[PDB]
Amino acid sequence: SKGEELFTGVVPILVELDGDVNGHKFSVSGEGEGDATYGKLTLKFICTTGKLPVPWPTLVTTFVQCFSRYPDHMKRHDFFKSAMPEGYVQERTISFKDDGNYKTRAEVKFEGDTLVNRIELKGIDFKEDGNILGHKLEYNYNSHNVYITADKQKNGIKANFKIRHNIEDGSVQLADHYQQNTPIGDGPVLLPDNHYLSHQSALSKDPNEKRDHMVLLEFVTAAGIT
Ligand SMILES: [Cl-]
Known part of the structure; x- marks a missing residue:
């Protein structure tokens, strides 16, 4: 299909995020590339406003499941590529246990040759010295389904x-x-049977980067259908 064909090689990615958490405003820009043949993502994010006012790991999920590797037998279940290039809107509520929540709305779509993820995030009801605003979270990340x-x-x-x-x-x-x-365009997409994306992530730093930043490498593969 047209959407599949957009992902057969390495695709440049751009990420832009405007955030407001407990009324503290911030922006993040990111860039790198995705290779859905391997399910592999490499990305570097810079906070362009100063220090990020929440922990970098709390933003990982927000900052492109179109780059997941769907096995051949699962290709009829890949909603994300089927919506491209017009793209999809991705909304979340993220509820931090005993703390505040983020709401996010992003558009993920090709803008010419580049896959772009443009997010607005609003965070409310956070504790002034809880794990989030207080930056008490480890700079690391675990695998999730x-x-x-x-x-x-x-x-x-x-x-x-x-x-x-x-x-x-x-x-x-x-x-x-x-x-x-939800797709951005009006036409048909692939609607999947129930399955999961196995996401694995590792966060590091560019020891030559003086700005507040996060380097993130990720591997994402679809599974759960035998
Ligand atoms: Cl899990």
Whole structure:
């Protein structure tokens, strides 16, 4: 299909995020590339406003599941590529256990030769010295399964999952994610049977980068259908 064909090699990516959490405003720009043949993503993000006012790991899920590797037998379930190049809107509520929540709305779509993810994020009701605004979360990340179900009435998909954020005290902060995707264009897409995306991530730093930043490498593959 047209959408599949857009991803057969390495595709440049651009990420732009405008955030407001507890009324503290911030912006992040990111860039890198995705290779859906390997399910592989490499990305570098810069906070362009100063220090990020929340922990870099709480933004990982927000900052392109179109680059997941769907196995050949699962190719009829790949909603994300089927919506391209016109793209899809990706909304989430992210509820941090005993703390505030983020709401995000992003558009993921090709703008010429580049896959772009443009996000607005608003965060409310955070504790002034909780794990988030206080920056108590470890700079690391765990593997998660993203359970995908069709959302036929929106011609898209929903997903539900909980991110495990390891805290500096040895405890874990859960970040419950509720996700809804809907195509930007009016035509048909692939509506999947229930399955999951296995996402694995590793966060590092560019020891030559003086700006507040995050380097993120990720591998994402679809599974759950035998
Ligand atoms: Cl999981």
